[PDB]
């Protein structure tokens, strides 16, 4: 049967492991609440005013579920299994179940609160599959879902940058007059969640939604030897090389070296010129990438108006510690506590670099671009790193290498987006007054994931991901990563190497 | 299933073009209350009583769902889309749905209230689709549908005025005694909505309308030229102008001129005559219809007696501003705040006027009637005008053009009424005491738009309407019209051209 | 129909006996709680600290059903007539039920609380027969099923020893460093109920689980004779006893006397050597049974590592009441109150003794291993004792006995592991708060035994059980045992002879 | 459908004369309460003590359903008719049905007490139609069925007489040491009606019992003379009576006289000896039935051990008001005061004596025993008596009449028992709290009875019960019996011809 008192779907979790497939199922318990009091509203984000830089978001009564990590799908047991065991991975489909619904009214009689369960409440679940609102996930956001499946999962309220600020800014002069900053206003998208379709659920009611990806893959397998020594050291070269003449030292000419033959391949592009810039507050990254239409008043200038690229090296030996990409395990996570910067995987189609030489040494080449024969191997992903990427709708772009490591595609996982449906209350005023609710829930993502084992003729062994790479952590200090504190917290990693990284384990000849 | 628990149905919304049809999808979260305490009252409406102006409504205890304006079922965007892709619409047909009810009761106890949800308690809904009662929408009214699909909807009580007042005044005298005044009160018709039969429906339940329309079309095509200049000032003309004497100059005969040849087409009707009267209490407008059957005592006379008609020029120009159509974006609005005035369009079939020569010079007729060879175009409707008004029932009536754009439909859309059941409660006294809830759910309407593409020679380009044609609003004034406030608050359109109307963009050769 | 309001499921219990099959229902009304807050912890668990013993567990959320032991299944009755109408007996098949679920919100307002049923709330409930996670049953615990089938059965929180304490202590030394003390850490197991999949029900709903035991049969006969008395003194012996000389009395060859012959039979193993230890509160058991790797540091030594193996003389008489199995009836029970000693059943294959002789006497072997021809029986098992025993997971393996008399199943029935779903509510803060609630139900436990009746050719009466070997208690001390005291207390056996024994009445010829 | 919101079953009542059947329905509405709090308990039932008469019980949590009396089953006007038409009736078949349960919670806040329907809650309902649990009815107890439908009936709990007390005393000696006496404790039953499979029952589900008599007749017809009579006085009879010498009259012999006959019938047994005991409190009856085996100790004697036989005189005429059966209309009734004093139904096979003649004359003889050749009608049983009595399992038995004038049957209609199942409550100490709930339903017996209608050839009129028959009572002494005062109550018969007893009404020719 169905109705209240009947639940509505069980509890899912776990992974199978086969050959060409890995499953793994996941639910949370999921709590969402009323946002914005129901409205839509676009205010400006302001930060301490140091600088000039500034955002316009415009903040809907929605929140929306981010299943976009690996650290979600996967425990550290499935994805020590994972990367030691497979040498290519990707997502074939994707389903998310929401079920077990139950909206209760909050009642707050001064301090202490009670809570009572209304039965005829619904909640709004919408799925953009099209991509026609604008996306609400972006990659490395603390909004995803929680590693440990008794966690409670928190949504966010979804928003979104209608224009960019500065070109709207207004500031322009009593010269110009701003027409053409006014015109970017005047066009200025304005998204409501309630233009589309959607369900409206009660508690005997559950949705589902299922996705298919098609993407490329995730590759585990690491280089040995750079693609320049591809070559026999014993085999004599034809080639010559001739020296120009340099001082008093004559133009020599005379064939190559045998253990130093010339390459046909180049180092993957990446950018180490710039140096991040100002206070933790604006935006720092050492490249912008901005917009400035002519005509248009930017009073701030540098990076008020853009935003940053970070990290700027995507092949190349990260020189600096800016360059090294670097997140946190933890929302409570301070400066330098809880951080964890990426490390060399020591995959020779990664961490390169370029010398250009003059006739008396040779010099680092500051930044890179596209370049014909360039070969590289993508970020070497963690299990914190995002799974994908939404890849802008443009006429033209060149390859898609993001350089935080996750996927670019065109049609992601769409957003699930759930809301309070509104209960009005009556008021004598205009003061629309509405009910209190929330709901809490049960979502389920279970992915199947397209795995394909290696094989090697190395007679050797190779290095795997082992729980002897961990650190002991909590209180006394006797707990160890990936495991429950005495007061129940858990124990994040605290280097790159516990995160067990892919492109480190499994060699692949060049 | 059904029940308790099970929602009844989803959200629809948004808008799917296409050649032949437009599907404009709605849906809202409305709340009802208890109206009267359940009771039928005929009280007097007073004004502050300067002048002797007062009607007379007999108010019911329902509420009721008001779906006409064109704001409600069109976006900013699905308008501008549609006027000026679209050289003529109708409507073909609506559905509304009615589901997604709550009920819930109001408890008070001192300042604070609480509401819990009873689930027995139902509520009357009926259509009245034959018009047996009075109608309750009538064109311009605040009880529309709101614009933005996430608005609560607060109905309207529903009332209906019985008699006309003064007719009806007992002023009379002691000399006449006023017996055909007494004549008119003996039959005063009294309509109960609970004669009829209509639907209860609890929380599990739901309901549903359809309604099909057969009406005239919106012609959005814009006439560049006047039926006059229908001619050819190149080719002759075989006529002849007869001028007789006029003082000393004698009469002439002689071939009329090649570039001003003959209309045969005159001035659509209006009436420039008449000026508004009053203060803003009393009925203000140019022209009173009014009812005087003999023997009847009227004491205070002019607008007293009558409702005003208002705009009194139909196709004239609109010498004044006392003539042009003008309404509110919102309820708050006060005078001149929010105010929005009509202004032409640019149609050559609007906007007309006709000149009265004598033998020196010509003059303005005041007011024209209906005569022979009439062509005109109908009010350029707006986003905001009413969609269709209700045809009087009557033996004979002229051509039916409503100077406010609005359709005369003699079975416009059904009105659907919606109350609370009276839930009784147990008193000792005569005090027939009720309990005290309120209904809020999900109405939705969706109706299917009869359009038809437009197709011209015309080598030039044509006027669009463009968002570069809004201005700029909100707190700090950054915000576009038709967009969102920091606050919340939704920006309206301050002028006639931001709201989008018709008969401006594509041109109809004559 | 199913839903709210319709019963999922009535009550069974009693007993019908056949030949061939027994089938015990039980019913018991359970109650199970939020555990640790909804939290997974790994916290060391002190006793007084007068010695160097700990142990770390981590504590689930979750409670579990404990149905092992006799005293659940069987009542005195159902015993009685068990032990003396059969010969032996096991458990075919086994089937748990757990419907009438009740999930009600304990809301607390200062002192006085109450109880509200939410009816939307539901509860995980997950059996394991895999045995993927720890077992939570270990034998002769307090958790199990009560006795009386109209008392509440509160359950008890799963927990579990991830590591051996004083392995992992992190004592080590300045010198020493503990590395490889720090590698049991690293690779330290972390389980959660939640990886793999389970139901979730509300009220309406109910869950069924089967389990099929293969295992080995309890033997209710008894020995009359010692295996070494198998013989007839009247037949006279072929065999030859030659006794070296002692002292002064010369050897001396002779055939064996009629009345002892030789016996090819053995004592079975057992260990009197060892003694209790220390305090109370450490770990008093004779033997230790420990794991010291090399490398490892242990401060506290003797008892602190290791797990002590009690009783420690399986087979053998027990010298001293240290080797007595002993227990207490009730969990109120203190030390001597409530106690109940295991006593000699008088069966000869039981509480065997081994002498090693010298040329002058015999003395006492204090510790037999096991060595051919040797045969025993099985402790003589109670109604109060623990049904199964899982057997460990191992390459190697002796043969199964445990001492306590338990059957020890490499399978046994799987763990109903039961909680609360988290109901999560909003805070402002991190503070994750959540709903207060409980669940209490019907659980119903119903085996079928496998059972087969004596026959004997023995002409004289056995022993039988009969409650004429019973005792008063309670209040003024008229109440029998197994009967309930005017407070309404149940009257506990106060002897072992009172649980009713196997192993004592039928006799087996040898 | 079924669930919350739909009754199960309606309301039944009235009765259905034919000629060959009777069928009367009731039905009531009843409420059972948590009893004991949920506890088994035995406990000694104290008088004033002023004499050692004592009793022990063991109650149960479990209350009951006693449909044992015929005022339950027949209106005053189906009695009346009942016994006016037919000679003879009994009850084929009986159906229970239980349904439209309501169980609330009872929420007490100082003195006001609230109560709130949880909807979850069951109750255990169990029939014994094997008699495998103790009786729990007995004849002329107050827990019978309310006499009119409108009243609420409080049902009873459950206890039953494990044993004997004075048996099993304990009071002994030191030198006996009451061995025999403990063997009686050490066998005491306890019976747990958990033992039994039983249904729970939520307020949307119901249950229904049948059960099917087999049993002697009640027969409503008199005897006008006695059997000694069934001669004809004009015809000379044969036989001889000699009388012996007397004194000084000589013996003679002579034909016995046409007028007496002698009688081949005897009296029906009865016991006239016996005269009450001791005061109110103690048992008083003429004759105490008990059980003394040797050995044990019995220090009170008398009465204090057995129980009392009344009315002793089964068919002999009750010389005295102590013989006469009596007992109280209503619950209320104290001495003297609403009291029903059996009277003679002036049937000749009533209220027999015998005399023993010795020479001079003729003496009552005071108690008579079975003899052959006797002959008798059972007690006239009123509308108040109950209809059947438990036959004890017992190898041998006399003829059954029980001298109340129930029917003994060895299976009466089961006993029909219901509690609330336990709903526990979380408390951190053992106190083991439970929530506090009770059940209010509709419990409808409908009884089929077998009737036989009278046919007589006597040519007179006979007696009938006639509402001629009754007096007036209530307040202001208007209200005539069986009718209902002003206050509302009841009157109550004062006399045992208003309670229209059977055997007065028609005649049977002996």
């Given at each position: 049967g169905s109705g209240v008192g009947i639940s509505t779907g069980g509890w899912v979790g776990g992974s199978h492991f086969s050959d060409k497939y890995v499953v793994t199922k996941n639910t949370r318990q999921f709590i969402t609440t009323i946002q914005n009091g129901h409205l839509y509203k676009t205010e400006a984000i302001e930060t301490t005013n140091q600088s000039?830089?500034?955002?316009?978001?415009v903040t809907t009564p929605w929140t929306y579920f981010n299943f976009n990590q690996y650290s979600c799908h996967f425990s550290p047991q499935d994805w020590q299994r994972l990367t030691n065991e497979y040498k290519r991975f990707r997502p074939k489909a994707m389903q998310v179940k929401i079920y077990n619904l139950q909206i209760k009214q909050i009642l707050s009689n001064g301090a202490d609160t009670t809570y009572n369960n209304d039965l005829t409440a619904g909640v709004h679940i919408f799925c953009d599959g099209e991509h026609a609102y604008p996306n609400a996930s972006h990659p490395w956001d603390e909004d995803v879902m929680p590693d440990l499946p008794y966690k409670t999962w928190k949504l966010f309220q979804y928003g979104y940058i209608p224009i960019e600020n500065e070109l709207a800014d207004l500031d322009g002069n009593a010269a110009g007059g701003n027409a053409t900053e006014k015109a970017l206003l005047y066009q200025m998208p304005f998204f409501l969640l309630e233009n589309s379709d959607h369900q409206v659920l009660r508690t005997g009611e559950s949705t589902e939604f299922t996705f298919n990806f098609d993407c490329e893959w995730v590759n585990?397998?690491?280089?040995?030897?750079?693609?320049?020594?591809?070559?026999?050291?014993?085999?004599?070269?034809?080639?010559?090389?001739?020296?120009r003449q340099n001082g008093s030292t004559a133009a020599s000419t005379g064939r190559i070296q045998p253990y130093s033959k010339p390459t046909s391949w180049m180092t993957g592009p990446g950018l180490l010129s710039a140096q991040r810039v100002g206070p933790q507050s604006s935006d720092t990254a050492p490249f912008?990438?901005?917009?400035?239409?002519?005509?248009?008043?930017?009073?701030?200038?540098?990076?008020?108006?853009?935003?940053g690229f970070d990290p700027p090296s995507g092949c190349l030996a990260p020189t600096n510690?800016?360059?090294?990409?670097?997140?946190?395990?933890?929302?409570?996570?301070?400066?330098?506590?809880?951080?964890?910067?990426?490390?060399?995987?020591?995959s020779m189609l990664r961490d390169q670099l370029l010398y250009k030489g003059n006739q008396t040494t040779y010099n680092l080449v500051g930044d890179i671009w596209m370049f014909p024969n360039q070969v590289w191997d993508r970020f070497p992903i963690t299990r914190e790193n995002p799974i994908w990427c939404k890849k802008p709708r443009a006429d033209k772009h060149t390859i898609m290498d993001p350089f935080d490591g996750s996927i670019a595609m065109d049609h992601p996982p769409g957003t699930i987006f759930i809301k309070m449906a509104k209960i009005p209350v009556?008021?004598?005023?205009?003061?629309?007054?509405?009910?209190?609710?929330?709901?809490?829930?049960?979502?389920?993502?279970?992915?199947?994931?397209?795995?394909?084992?290696?094989?090697?003729?190395?007679?050797?062994?190779?290095?795997?991901?082992?729980?002897?790479?961990?650190?002991?952590?909590?209180?006394?200090?006797?707990?160890?990563?990936?495991?429950?504190?005495?007061?129940?917290?858990?124990?994040?990693?605290t280097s790159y190497d516990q995160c067990m990284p892919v492109k480190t384990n499994i060699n692949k000849v060049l």
């Open positions: 000039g830089k500034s955002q316009r978001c585990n397998e690491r280089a040995y030897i750079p693609p320049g020594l591809m070559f026999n050291p014993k085999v004599p070269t034809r080639r010559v090389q001739y020296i912008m990438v901005c917009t400035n239409p002519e005509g248009t008043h930017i009073n701030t200038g540098a990076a008020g108006f853009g935003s510690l800016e360059y090294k990409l670097q997140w946190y395990q933890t929302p409570e996570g301070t400066g330098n506590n809880g951080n964890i910067i990426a490390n060399p995987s020591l009556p008021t004598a005023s205009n003061a629309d007054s509405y009910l209190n609710i929330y709901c809490t829930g049960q979502v389920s993502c279970e992915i199947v994931w397209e795995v394909e084992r290696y094989a090697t003729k190395n007679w050797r062994p190779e290095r795997r991901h082992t729980a002897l790479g961990m650190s002991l952590g909590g209180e006394s200090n006797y707990t160890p990563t990936y495991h429950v504190d005495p007061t129940g917290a858990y124990i994040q990693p």
